[PDB]
Design a protein around this motif. Structure first.
Motif, short mmCIF file in Angstrom:
data_model
loop_
_atom_site.label_atom_id
_atom_site.label_comp_id
_atom_site.label_asym_id
_atom_site.label_seq_id
_atom_site.Cartn_x
_atom_site.Cartn_y
_atom_site.Cartn_z
N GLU A 276 0.86 -1.18 0.00
CA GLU A 276 0.00 0.00 0.00
C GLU A 276 0.90 1.23 0.00
OE1 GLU A 276 -2.08 -1.26 3.57
OE2 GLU A 276 -3.97 -1.09 2.46
N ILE A 277 2.10 1.08 0.56
CA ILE A 277 3.07 2.16 0.61
C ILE A 277 3.68 2.37 -0.76
CG2 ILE A 277 5.37 2.78 1.38
CD1 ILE A 277 4.61 1.53 4.09
N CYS A 278 3.87 1.29 -1.51
CA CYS A 278 4.42 1.43 -2.85
C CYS A 278 3.47 2.32 -3.65
CB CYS A 278 4.55 0.05 -3.52
SG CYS A 278 5.97 -0.88 -2.85
N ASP A 279 2.17 2.13 -3.42
CA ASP A 279 1.16 2.90 -4.12
C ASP A 279 1.12 4.33 -3.59
OD1 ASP A 279 -1.07 3.29 -5.91
OD2 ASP A 279 -2.42 3.13 -4.18
N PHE A 280 1.28 4.47 -2.28
CA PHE A 280 1.26 5.76 -1.61
C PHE A 280 2.40 6.68 -2.04
CE2 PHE A 280 2.92 8.56 1.65
CZ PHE A 280 1.80 9.15 2.24
N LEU A 281 3.51 6.10 -2.48
CA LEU A 281 4.68 6.88 -2.89
C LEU A 281 4.51 7.78 -4.11
CD1 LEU A 281 6.35 6.32 -0.61
CD2 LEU A 281 7.64 4.63 -1.93
N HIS A 282 3.69 7.36 -5.09
CA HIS A 282 3.46 8.16 -6.29
C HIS A 282 2.78 9.48 -5.89
CE1 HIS A 282 4.68 4.63 -8.57
NE2 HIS A 282 3.65 3.93 -8.13
N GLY A 283 3.59 10.54 -6.08
CA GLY A 283 3.22 11.94 -5.79
C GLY A 283 3.56 12.33 -4.35
N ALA A 284 4.44 11.60 -3.67
CA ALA A 284 4.78 11.93 -2.29
C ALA A 284 6.25 12.31 -2.24
CB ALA A 284 4.50 10.75 -1.39
N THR A 285 6.62 13.09 -1.23
CA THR A 285 8.00 13.50 -1.06
C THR A 285 8.66 12.41 -0.22
OG1 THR A 285 7.13 15.75 -0.77
CG2 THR A 285 9.51 15.41 -0.44
N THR A 286 9.86 12.00 -0.59
CA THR A 286 10.53 10.96 0.18
C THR A 286 11.77 11.53 0.86
OG1 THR A 286 11.74 10.25 -1.80
CG2 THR A 286 9.71 9.06 -1.24
N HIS A 287 11.95 11.15 2.12
CA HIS A 287 13.08 11.61 2.91
C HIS A 287 13.72 10.41 3.59
CE1 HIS A 287 11.35 15.54 2.31
NE2 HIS A 287 10.28 15.25 3.03
N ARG A 288 14.92 10.60 4.11
CA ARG A 288 15.62 9.52 4.79
C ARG A 288 16.52 10.04 5.91
NH1 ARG A 288 16.93 4.20 3.19
NH2 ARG A 288 15.92 4.75 1.20
N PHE A 289 16.23 9.61 7.14
CA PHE A 289 17.06 10.00 8.28
C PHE A 289 18.39 9.32 8.01
CE2 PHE A 289 12.81 9.32 10.39
CZ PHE A 289 12.53 10.66 10.66
N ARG A 290 19.44 10.09 7.77
CA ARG A 290 20.73 9.47 7.49
C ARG A 290 21.33 8.93 8.78
NH1 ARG A 290 23.34 14.09 4.73
NH2 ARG A 290 21.27 14.91 5.30
N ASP A 291 20.96 9.54 9.90
CA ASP A 291 21.45 9.12 11.20
C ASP A 291 20.98 7.71 11.56
OD1 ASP A 291 23.24 10.90 12.28
OD2 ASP A 291 21.72 12.07 13.40
N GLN A 292 19.68 7.47 11.39
CA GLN A 292 19.06 6.19 11.71
C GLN A 292 18.95 5.23 10.53
OE1 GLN A 292 15.66 7.30 14.34
NE2 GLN A 292 15.92 9.29 13.33
N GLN A 293 19.16 5.76 9.33
CA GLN A 293 19.14 4.98 8.10
C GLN A 293 17.83 4.30 7.76
OE1 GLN A 293 23.55 4.08 7.48
NE2 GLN A 293 22.86 2.54 8.96
N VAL A 294 16.74 5.06 7.88
CA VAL A 294 15.41 4.57 7.56
C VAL A 294 14.68 5.73 6.89
CG1 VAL A 294 15.07 2.68 9.14
CG2 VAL A 294 15.01 4.99 9.98
N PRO A 295 13.81 5.44 5.91
CA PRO A 295 13.07 6.49 5.21
C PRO A 295 11.71 6.84 5.79
CG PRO A 295 12.59 4.47 4.16
CD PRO A 295 13.60 4.13 5.26
N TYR A 296 11.12 7.90 5.24
CA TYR A 296 9.77 8.35 5.59
C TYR A 296 9.23 9.16 4.42
CZ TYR A 296 11.61 13.05 7.01
OH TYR A 296 12.22 14.29 7.07
N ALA A 297 7.92 9.22 4.28
CA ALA A 297 7.33 9.96 3.18
C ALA A 297 6.19 10.85 3.66
CB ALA A 297 6.84 9.00 2.09
#
Ligand SMILES: CC(=O)N[C@@H]1[C@@H](O)[C@H](O[C@H]2O[C@H](CO)[C@@H](O[C@@H]3O[C@H](CO)[C@@H](O[C@@H]4O[C@H](CO)[C@@H](O[C@@H]5O[C@H](CO)[C@@H](O)[C@H](O)[C@H]5NC(C)=O)[C@H](O)[C@H]4NC(C)=O)[C@H](O)[C@H]3NC(C)=O)[C@H](O)[C@H]2NC(C)=O)[C@@H](CO)O[C@H]1O
Ligand SMILES: *[C@@H]1O[C@H](CO)[C@@H](O[C@H]2O[C@H](CO)[C@@H](O[C@H]3O[C@H](CO)[C@@H](O[C@H]4O[C@H](CO)[C@@H](O)[C@H](O)[C@@H]4O)[C@H](O)[C@@H]3O)[C@H](O)[C@H]2NC(C)=O)[C@H](O)[C@H]1NC(C)=O
Length: 361
Positions: A276-297
């Motif tokens: 559902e997240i793969c679908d949610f990504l289209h048109g969303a901004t993606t970021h990634r905590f480089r400190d913790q090494q995990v993404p968020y959108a």
């Protein structure tokens, strides 16, 4: 290296493509598949869904194609009252009754072991959890005398320092358990008023105060407490936890109005399947905590903390570098099992990414 994959009973009722049955599982993906969850009645293990004996059968047939595949049945879970586990573990009488009921059950339906998912033992339970494990193993040993292969015994354990200190005697229960699944993924979320990642890998000099909420800490601790590395398995999530923003602020610290809107197939506030997240990504901004090494959108007023292939291969390299026994995945039915939602026509992208890293040097 071991790859423990959980399959959930209720994913059969998801509509459309969200529907997942045991046969959608690749028999060569994981080394162990765990069915969630079993019930307890009259202090005896028992089924949960009306068609468990059928799905049980469907799952265990996978072993006809891969003879090395081992399967287990998990008792407990989150929609199971921990008070219920409590009442059973503290009365030596009902504890023995439950223990005695287990082997024949597993034997009949073709499972190779039992997985204990008591969530969670309080301070008054530590003494009994140890007892349950001790005696449960003792029983599995005596049952191997009939000439069949000895049953396995595992447990899913909290990764919260406070939770561990409160109800687990790690040094004790590690001698008796065949492996321990570390639930390294529900660190934030849990109804808080700020935004944050639920399964970060490292602390990351940013926003400290809950210095113990990351896989690295939880792991180093378990090791310090007495669990041997060859018995630990690190949990990797396949779902993201969502939040409804309460402002246009999107970076760390941003206020939350509550959990995120429900996924279209998972239909549960606060979580989204990876597909559902793969679908949610289209048109969303993606970021990634480089400190913790995990993404968020983010997209609109929705903020999502999740795990992509990169963060997952990353977690896999980590457990390898610390010589852990393997990885645990929750859950096969939340990954892109049909492999038609995430782009690259690949069935089970997340779990596979983990398997690949584990298969390397
Ligand atoms: C390592 C480890 O131990 N794992 C941890 C997990 O426990 C964590 O969370 C997960 O666990 C909870 C359960 O403990 C799980 O909760 C599930 O919630 C969903 C709703 O969101 C329930 O879905 C509903 O299920 C029932 C039956 O199971 C369905 O009812 C049936 O309806 C049809 C018609 O619709 C009938 O034909 C059937 O007869 C009927 N009745 C029954 C009960 O037989 C219903 O359709 C379905 N639909 C709805 C209303 O949404 C599901 O039952 C719950 N699970 C259980 C065992 O009851 C939770 O979703 C899950 N969390 C996630 C995100 O996976 C996990 C958390 O991250 O981490 C580990 O720590
Ligand atoms: C998992 O296992 C749980 C614990 O073993 C199950 O718990 C439930 O069990 C009973 C029976 O299903 C629930 O019954 C309640 O409602 C009925 C009326 O609808 C009351 O009548 C019952 O009482 C007598 C027992 O003396 C029976 O002879 C009679 O047939 C009838 O069932 C009953 O008194 C009680 O009020 C009970 O509420 C509930 N107990 C608990 C603590 O959960 C549970 O059903 C199982 N879950 C699943 C999904 O399998």
């Amino acid at each position: 290296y071991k790859l423990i994959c959980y399959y959930t009973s209720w994913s059969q009722y998801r509509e459309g493509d969200g529907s997942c049955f045991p046969d959608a599982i690749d028999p060569f993906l994981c080394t162990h598949v765990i069915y969630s969850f079993a019930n307890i009645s009259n202090n005896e293990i028992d089924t949960w869904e009306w068609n468990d004996v059928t799905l049980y059968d469907t799952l265990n047939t996978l072993k006809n194609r891969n003879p090395k595949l081992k399967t287990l049945l998990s008792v407990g879970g989150w929609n199971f009252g921990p008070e219920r586990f409590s009442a059973i573990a503290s009365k030596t009488q009902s504890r023995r009754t439950f223990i005695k009921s287990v082997p024949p059950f597993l034997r009949t339906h073709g499972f190779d072991g039992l997985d204990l998912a008591w969530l969670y033992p309080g301070r008054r339970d530590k003494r009994h959890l140890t007892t349950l494990v001790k005696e449960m193993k003792a029983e599995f040993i005596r049952e191997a005398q009939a000439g069949t292969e000895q049953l396995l015994l595992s447990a899913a354990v909290s990764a919260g320092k406070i939770a561990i200190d409160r109800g687990y005697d790690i040094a004790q229960i590690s001698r008796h358990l065949d492996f321990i699944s570390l639930l390294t993924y529900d660190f934030h979320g849990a109804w808080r008023q700020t935004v944050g990642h639920h399964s970060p890998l490292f602390a990351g000099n940013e926003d400290a105060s809950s210095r113990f909420s990351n896989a690295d800490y939880a792991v180093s601790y378990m090791l310090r407490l007495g669990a041997p590395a060859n018995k630990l398995v690190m949990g990797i999530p396949t779902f993201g936890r969502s939040f409804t923003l309460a402002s246009s602020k999107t970076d760390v610290g941003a206020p939350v109005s509550g959990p995120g809107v429900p996924g279209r197939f998972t239909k549960e506030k606060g979580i989204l399947a990876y597909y559902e997240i793969c679908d949610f990504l289209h048109g969303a901004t993606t970021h990634r905590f480089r400190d913790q090494q995990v993404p968020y959108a983010t997209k609109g007023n929705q903020w999502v903390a999740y795990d992509d292939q990169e963060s997952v291969k990353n977690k896999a390299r980590y457990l390898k570098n610390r010589q852990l026994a393997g990885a645990m995945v929750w859950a096969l039915d939340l990954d892109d099992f049909r492999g038609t939602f995430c782009g690259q026509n690949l069935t089970f992208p997340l779990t596979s990414a983990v398997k690949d890293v584990l298969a390397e040097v």
